[PDB]
Design a protein around this ligand. Sequence first.
Ligand SMILES: CC(=O)O[C@H]1C(=O)[C@@]2(C)[C@H]([C@H](OC(=O)c3ccccc3)[C@]3(O)C[C@H](OC(=O)[C@H](O)[C@@H](NC(=O)c4ccccc4)c4ccccc4)C(C)=C1C3(C)C)[C@]1(OC(C)=O)CO[C@@H]1C[C@@H]2O
Ligand SMILES: CC(=O)O[C@H]1C(=O)[C@@]2(C)[C@H]([C@H](OC(=O)c3ccccc3)[C@]3(O)C[C@H](OC(=O)[C@H](O)[C@@H](NC(=O)c4ccccc4)c4ccccc4)C(C)=C1C3(C)C)[C@]1(OC(C)=O)CO[C@@H]1C[C@@H]2O
Ligand SMILES: CC[C@H](/C=C(/C)[C@@H]1C[C@@H](OC)C[C@H](O)C(C)(C)[C@@]2(O)O[C@@H](C[C@@H](OC)[C@H](O)C(=O)O1)C[C@@H](OC)[C@H]2O)CO
Ligand SMILES: CC[C@H](/C=C(/C)[C@@H]1C[C@@H](OC)C[C@H](O)C(C)(C)[C@@]2(O)O[C@@H](C[C@@H](OC)[C@H](O)C(=O)O1)C[C@@H](OC)[C@H]2O)CO
Ligand SMILES: Nc1nc2c(ncn2[C@@H]2O[C@H](COP(=O)(O)OP(=O)(O)OP(=O)(O)O)[C@@H](O)[C@H]2O)c(=O)[nH]1
Ligand SMILES: Nc1nc2c(ncn2[C@@H]2O[C@H](COP(=O)(O)OP(=O)(O)OP(=O)(O)O)[C@@H](O)[C@H]2O)c(=O)[nH]1
Ligand SMILES: Nc1nc2c(ncn2[C@@H]2O[C@H](COP(=O)(O)OP(=O)(O)O)[C@@H](O)[C@H]2O)c(=O)[nH]1
Ligand SMILES: Nc1nc2c(ncn2[C@@H]2O[C@H](COP(=O)(O)OP(=O)(O)O)[C@@H](O)[C@H]2O)c(=O)[nH]1
Ligand SMILES: [Mg+2]
Ligand SMILES: [Mg+2]
Lengths: 427, 427, 426, 426
Amino acid sequence: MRECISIHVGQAGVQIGNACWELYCLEHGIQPDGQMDSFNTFFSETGAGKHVPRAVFVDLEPTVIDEVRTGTYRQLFHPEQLITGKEDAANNYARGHYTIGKEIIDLVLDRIRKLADQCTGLQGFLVFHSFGGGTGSGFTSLLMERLSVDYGKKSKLEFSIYPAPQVSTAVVEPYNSILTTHTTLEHSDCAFMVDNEAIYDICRRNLDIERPTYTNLNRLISQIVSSITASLRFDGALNVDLTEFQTNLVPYPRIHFPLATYAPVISAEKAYHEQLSVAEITNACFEPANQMVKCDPRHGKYMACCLLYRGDVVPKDVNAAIATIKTKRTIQFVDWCPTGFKVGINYQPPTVVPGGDLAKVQRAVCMLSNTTAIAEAWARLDHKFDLMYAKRAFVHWYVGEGMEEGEFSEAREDMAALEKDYEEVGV
Amino acid sequence: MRECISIHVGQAGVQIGNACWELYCLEHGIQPDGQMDSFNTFFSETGAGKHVPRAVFVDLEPTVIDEVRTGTYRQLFHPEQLITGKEDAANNYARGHYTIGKEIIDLVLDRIRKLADQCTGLQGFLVFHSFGGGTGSGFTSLLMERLSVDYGKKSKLEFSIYPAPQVSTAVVEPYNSILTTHTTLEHSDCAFMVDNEAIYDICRRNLDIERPTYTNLNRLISQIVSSITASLRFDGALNVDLTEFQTNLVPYPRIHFPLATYAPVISAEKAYHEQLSVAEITNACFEPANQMVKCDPRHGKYMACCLLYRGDVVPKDVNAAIATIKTKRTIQFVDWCPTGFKVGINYQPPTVVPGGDLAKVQRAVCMLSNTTAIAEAWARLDHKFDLMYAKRAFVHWYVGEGMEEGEFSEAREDMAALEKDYEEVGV
Amino acid sequence: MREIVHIQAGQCGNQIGAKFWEVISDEHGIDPTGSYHGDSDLQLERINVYYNEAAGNKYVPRAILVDLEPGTMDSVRSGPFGQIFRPDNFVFGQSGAGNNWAKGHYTEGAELVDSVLDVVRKESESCDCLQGFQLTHSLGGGTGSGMGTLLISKIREEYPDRIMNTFSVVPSPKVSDTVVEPYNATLSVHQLVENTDETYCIDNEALYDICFRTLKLTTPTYGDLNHLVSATMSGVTTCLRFPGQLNADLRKLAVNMVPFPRLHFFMPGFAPLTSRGSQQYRALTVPELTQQMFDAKNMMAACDPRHGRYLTVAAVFRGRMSMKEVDEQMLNVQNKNSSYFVEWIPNNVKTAVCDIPPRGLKMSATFIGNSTAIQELFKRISEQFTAMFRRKAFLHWYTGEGMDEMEFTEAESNMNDLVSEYQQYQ
Amino acid sequence: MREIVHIQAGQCGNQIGAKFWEVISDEHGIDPTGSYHGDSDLQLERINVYYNEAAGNKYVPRAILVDLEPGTMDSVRSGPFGQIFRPDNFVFGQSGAGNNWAKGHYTEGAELVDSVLDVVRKESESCDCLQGFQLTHSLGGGTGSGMGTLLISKIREEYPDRIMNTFSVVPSPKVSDTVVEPYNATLSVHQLVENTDETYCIDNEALYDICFRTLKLTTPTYGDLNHLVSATMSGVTTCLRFPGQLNADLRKLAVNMVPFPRLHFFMPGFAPLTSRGSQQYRALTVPELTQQMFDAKNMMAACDPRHGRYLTVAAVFRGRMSMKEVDEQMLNVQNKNSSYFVEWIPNNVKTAVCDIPPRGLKMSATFIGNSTAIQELFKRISEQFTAMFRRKAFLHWYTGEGMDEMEFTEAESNMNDLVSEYQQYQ
Ligand SMILES: CC(=O)O[C@H]1C(=O)[C@@]2(C)[C@H]([C@H](OC(=O)c3ccccc3)[C@]3(O)C[C@H](OC(=O)[C@H](O)[C@@H](NC(=O)c4ccccc4)c4ccccc4)C(C)=C1C3(C)C)[C@]1(OC(C)=O)CO[C@@H]1C[C@@H]2O
Ligand SMILES: CC(=O)O[C@H]1C(=O)[C@@]2(C)[C@H]([C@H](OC(=O)c3ccccc3)[C@]3(O)C[C@H](OC(=O)[C@H](O)[C@@H](NC(=O)c4ccccc4)c4ccccc4)C(C)=C1C3(C)C)[C@]1(OC(C)=O)CO[C@@H]1C[C@@H]2O
Ligand SMILES: CC[C@H](/C=C(/C)[C@@H]1C[C@@H](OC)C[C@H](O)C(C)(C)[C@@]2(O)O[C@@H](C[C@@H](OC)[C@H](O)C(=O)O1)C[C@@H](OC)[C@H]2O)CO
Ligand SMILES: CC[C@H](/C=C(/C)[C@@H]1C[C@@H](OC)C[C@H](O)C(C)(C)[C@@]2(O)O[C@@H](C[C@@H](OC)[C@H](O)C(=O)O1)C[C@@H](OC)[C@H]2O)CO
Ligand SMILES: Nc1nc2c(ncn2[C@@H]2O[C@H](COP(=O)(O)OP(=O)(O)OP(=O)(O)O)[C@@H](O)[C@H]2O)c(=O)[nH]1
Ligand SMILES: Nc1nc2c(ncn2[C@@H]2O[C@H](COP(=O)(O)OP(=O)(O)OP(=O)(O)O)[C@@H](O)[C@H]2O)c(=O)[nH]1
Ligand SMILES: Nc1nc2c(ncn2[C@@H]2O[C@H](COP(=O)(O)OP(=O)(O)O)[C@@H](O)[C@H]2O)c(=O)[nH]1
Ligand SMILES: Nc1nc2c(ncn2[C@@H]2O[C@H](COP(=O)(O)OP(=O)(O)O)[C@@H](O)[C@H]2O)c(=O)[nH]1
Ligand SMILES: [Mg+2]
Ligand SMILES: [Mg+2]
């Protein structure tokens, strides 16, 4: 069957993974200890009955994984799936890659191989990292490269924490992200990217919450992930396998970045002041502020769009909605693509956790989008990098562990090329 | 179906809207929480069964809407339909328009669009403001202008709080009202205007009440509104749709102002000392003091009259009454209009709220009137404005936020033109 | 053969229509769901004239309901006999007309009319030999008036050899019922003069007079008025549905009633009209019936026929009667008061008779008058029109939908010419 | 004799297939486990056409289920009528196609197709006289589209003298349903033009229009769409399974419907199509049925047939009917509207009839149209293709599996030639 493995790497990735696992447990009826039909896509079938997931959990930081190992979702995990080392990169690309990561990576590969050995049709991977964080950027890149050698035909999807233009966390992100882009590019297939500023905005407006945490964010991410994956596991009108997200979303083999957005993301309060019909949901999906990154999508033609409807969904309504969207003048599309939309309709609805603010909905959607409008963010990032690098800010740290500066230049060139390609596409 | 939206803007407007909503709840059987046939004209059909109105609630004043949000008619409303900001204009036309309103207006427009997206035949709007109050005059004008761009074919009816000649509230009304007139004129279709002095007079004589409030006034207004609208919702002998009040009431495309008057407005005491026959009601409607503005209608020819009979009504009787009215020498009519009266007869009677003084009547009427007799009030207003403006009273406030003084002159010119037109009509 | 397709347009048209279908149903022994429960084979002989047959001995009105204004037709549907109509024969839009002929005839109505035409075509195919189309509408509204005219134009274009008859509710000139009514009426009349073979002109004022003065009644409702109209309508087509001595037909009536092609505006009446209470005070002699028929107070148009000459008159009787009595009565009427019938047409009257009285009556009769006096009605309308149009009052509502001033002028001109023509034969 | 082997390919193909097997089961009195519970010997006379017999009076679909994508077929198996299929007739792989024709036709599909061929061969041996193969698939996917084409190629190679018919779900050109859909559709069409004798072209847009405009329905599910398809499918083969007056057959239909070898793309329809609610409003006359059949709004391809000429049309009726009525109806249709049927073929229509109405209906009919208008469909697809291919958009996914640019070009060329040919006879 359509049966697969996940990868959660670095602090952020691990956090996301926890949430994901919780969501999965809710969905498939599994109790935190492994006790309870088609669950087995992730949870490789087990000895005494108690289910155990297929996820690679990696952190060179001990602390986050240590927390997990003394949590509630604890015995659920295999000891080995969770991996440990000694110290952070500390936002240092030249440590996940090159120096310290080239040591653990072998172990990770072995684990992955072992996991694969249970599949009877390994459709691919899901990878969780951060365009920014030191471990989950260099290390993840390295891992992806390794996988490329050992699994050429298998899809490798990535869930990515792009840094928002204005807001920041650690002031060496512009280097790290760029480096990741340079070395991820050719080894991944798809990189689903979500900002944090956008999420915060959504929370403030749509969910009516002005005091968020990371936990909430993680839950939201997990929801999206679930939406993406549910066609593997449950039945459906139209089933979108992992390998479709290659072919209905990558118009050219360097453009690997889609924006992942969810709806309806509205709390219980003015949910009952709403219909929550299919058309409305679709409309919400294409609006600017509901997107989970900081693009003005009205500034950029859509290349490929992909929608994953869940729950009580009649295809006719969906079709109507899509037609309406097509009709709209502001939702721009490329010169070379008429069949812009890819639709998945799944008989199982989304499932809501205790503590998760998003209330119970009979129907919901996850949208995946490729556009020239992502290029703005890239350009901004490039600019940031250039401003940093001319005065040689913090270069000696990465170079002092094991790097050429020409690498940086190469990365910049690559970015420029990407930009040019985007421009061409727009034309 | 004939299915539509309302707009309630500014303090006064919001107050009126509350009353209106209460009345609607009474009429259609809806409980304050949304629980219970043809209600759905306003109350767009809902998810779990509990009905939610289609009204735009706007106040740059937080306080009034805050009160509503902690009232009884509370969960009934959608959170978004009610809108908030920060501070009043403070009877300052140059803040609803120009400065502060151009900020919220977009949101309001969006809301309106969303509401429209539920209609299967949006017949138009109902707008509640004040010729005088700072928010609901500039802001409302702005809103109307915006709507004109986004809905050209859709009717936009307005319910208006004209300031009475002698009595006043805030001593910058003469500016604001004039400004509103200048910028409303070409974007609205109809502006149903009600004074307060007239209402008070009615209360003193007809209802036998000498200690009124705003609440009572609001209730009265709501009654009128209900009478206006009931042909959309319930069955009838003759059904007057919103779009009829364009075509049976606007003889020329600048004359957009009718007087809205109601009968019988008599309490339980000397109701039983009365027959309350159709003819009597009709007679009451055309009498001077029962009118809801301060005109002497005997000083002015009628252009178009429109009557909306409700309850136990036989058309023959109505016809007889109309004939009698026509016969009368004092009820003057224009040289150019023979078919002066437009009649709507509705099988559903009016419905009385607990607390509302007007007792239960098997039959009742609402009358709408265009005449040269409205021009007197306009002239008075103009005079007031001119007296104010020559010594430059409070001009620096509006000008100091963002205005030309030439605007004032333009407004005055417009008023003069209107007056001239009225004179011509009279001829 | 002899099959009729019915169209009802606008609010009035629909309401009258409902009553008409009730009455016809009753007459043909059709129950409110559509089952036959008659005891006479006479009832089904020519049932095809109004009803199509369906599986399970179901009978369905050959009837089309049109309104741009939705909700009026919903009321019809909700009603008792609403369940007899074919759901696919409800054609409706999502916007009213604001009593605007231009919106009915030019813009909004044009968007809906295709559907109606399609349905009409479909209906036509189930006629062995289509007699024609029968329309119910009102002048003074937007849909019945404008869209009705539009539809009539289309249908005449497609079926010019079939008869086009309209039961049209006109204004009450002494107490008018909308503000733009004169504009609408004038615009419609133009269209009807050219594109119909006969128009039955019914006015509510006359109906109320009938109710009050003649029938001795009070509290009359629109329902009651509709009843009266429906009775005349049914009377008109009796000879297509049933046996008799002299059998009428649509074109036969037109042949005897329209001596010049444009003079086809009729004043319909019914008799007997006496009180329900004072029943026994009177009886049913043919002379009495004819008296009732011919008396001005018993007509349903807003004329004094005594202020003009009759060009022609058709009387349609129901019940088994002495033809001698009939003819002789007519002759006496003509002789005694020859001044009220134009002297240039020998034998202005016409008789038809059907052996089958409706429900209660032993003897009933329907009156169809074509008098020069009807000029009065048109004259008053033109007066109304002119007073407004010379000041271009309310005109912006129509020009805004693409109508031109010139059209209005031309319509007025045509109306005036009609009046002139009527005056000629006076 | 006259035995048919059924193949279902891909998700769509399997889903439609399930419905088809339910419907056929019902028709032949087979219960969900495979026992016969009919009351007529007519039911079993030619049951062999679709079903093999097994020990214990068990009947088994002569049906093969193929999907490289596993899990869709598991749903089928889990379903109610899933238990009727032979477990050995499920052929499935362990990898999806990502809506990739190249993976279905060249690489992944090539690895699975041997098994399918083996099963097909086995199936063929239990035919007394194999009529042919009937396939259900979709264009726009990878398995149904690519692998379906592959399988068809193989089967034609091995059984070139047996008839190859495909019920193929094509795109909805106004609102397309995948991104690479145009590529897939274009690639498949190339194969089908050359390697099948007839292809029934069904599009979801048309189905939804039928549901909404004609049947007056809402909330329609894929199940409902499948139902509609299944009904047409069953109608197509009725004359092989049952008695009648004029009995059709696959090649007979092909003989009357394919006047040039490559023009074998049909628009299927069913009649009657009216609302469930408004049943009594209409009845079952042959003329009404034919009207329903012939009206554009009632067709299941995405054309206005009025924008082209009919090359040929086959109507297959079920129910005991007047042949006079049938023939005369056809004649009238041709005479009245001769412009819509190409004048170079005298008698463009064909009739067949079977004495055995399906479940509820007394009279049912299946429509098969071959119109020059279908050029529109191909034209739009080619437009879609060109816009992408001129920028080599999405092409790397296909070249990566060994497909060459030249092939794409050639496919486009062939499609264009098809269009040109259709235009010739317009
Ligand atoms: C006890 C008795 O004999 O009662 C009579 C009756 O009193 C009188 C007054 C009836 C009555 O009619 C009215 O009062 C009336 C009300 C509104 C508008 C017009 C008339 C009667 O209601 C009407 C009714 O008419 C019929 O039955 C005809 O078949 C008539 N039917 C309908 O109009 C009808 C009413 C309800 C439901 C279905 C059909 C008809 C006439 C012409 C063509 C077809 C049908 C009759 C004779 C009577 C009553 C019942 C009191 C009269 O009218 C008719 C149309 O017959 C009024 O003057 C006549 C003389 C009748 O004698
Ligand atoms: C009380 C009654 O008479 O109900 C009818 C009915 O109301 C109508 C509306 C049926 C109904 O069909 C649909 O509503 C429909 C739903 C989805 C897609 C397509 C159609 C009916 O469901 C379908 C059903 O059809 C059959 O029984 C045929 O044998 C049909 N069977 C199936 O499709 C089938 C359904 C479920 C399970 C197994 C088989 C068939 C048609 C062609 C070839 C073989 C079989 C019938 C007549 C009816 C209902 C039950 C309401 C109609 O359809 C058919 C195929 O007959 C729709 O228009 C026709 C006219 C019928 O009168
Ligand atoms: C022939 C066409 C015809 C012309 C006339 C004038 C006809 C002739 C006669 O009827 C046939 C009159 C009739 O014989 C009567 C005297 C019994 C009587 O009915 O006359 C009317 C007044 C009369 O007009 C004066 C009436 O209105 C009317 O129309 O009369 C009062 C009435 O009170 C009970 C009664 O007294 C018009 O269509
Ligand atoms: C013969 C092949 C054929 C050609 C034509 C045009 C055929 C002929 C006739 O049907 C057989 C039309 C038919 O007689 C009607 C008029 C009753 C009717 O059905 O026509 C359609 C519109 C018509 O196209 C205009 C239709 O779509 C159609 O296809 O018509 C509206 C419909 O509303 C209820 C009704 O009014 C195409 O396959
Ligand atoms: N959405 C989300 N973002 C997170 C979370 N944790 C960290 N981040 C984001 O990830 C980025 C920081 O990377 P981390 O994952 O913390 O870093 P790391 O991978 O552990 O790498 P080092 O600590 O540098 O070795 C910042 O942009 C954070 O906002 C989380 O739980 N959820
Ligand atoms: N009938 C009625 N009139 C009211 C009500 N509230 C205020 N008014 C009248 O409205 C005018 C004042 O305008 P408001 O609506 O209070 O002012 P606003 O729109 O809030 O504008 P600012 O307060 O100036 O920002 C005065 O003429 C009041 O008498 C009410 O509830 N009913
Ligand atoms: N006799 C009769 N007149 C009606 C009826 N309904 C409305 N009217 C008259 O028709 C005119 C109003 O037009 P109406 O049909 O309601 O407007 P529409 O829906 O725009 O065509 C007025 O003169 C009314 O008195 C009815 O049921 N019977
Ligand atoms: N009519 C119909 N269309 C379907 C069904 N399932 C999928 N589709 C359509 O088939 C196309 C998608 O291809 P699908 O068969 O699911 O992909 P595959 O499994 O790769 O062949 C789309 O146009 C869908 O609308 C079905 O059950 N019925
Ligand atoms: Mg870390
Ligand atoms: Mg305020």
